[PDB]
């Protein structure tokens, strides 16, 4: 699939969107920008 998700981008210091295929991958993968920044934001 192509599903818009969020990950923390260490080069930007904040979360950014990416297309996720729907299975596998890793845990740097959040369904909203808010949730991403609550976990990985400074």
């Amino acid at each position: 699939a192509m599903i818009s998700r969020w990950y923390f981008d260490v080069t930007e210091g904040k979360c950014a969107p990416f297309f996720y295929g729907g299975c596998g991958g890793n845990r740097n993968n959040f369904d909203t920008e808010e949730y991403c920044m609550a976990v990985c934001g400074s």
Binding site: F18, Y20, G22, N26, R27, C40
Partner: peptide, 13 residues
């Protein structure tokens, strides 16, 4: 650290 891992679209993309 989870937050430093690469974005991974995974094998269903």
């Amino acid at each position: 650290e989870v937050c430093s891992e690469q974005a991974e679209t995974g094998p269903c993309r």
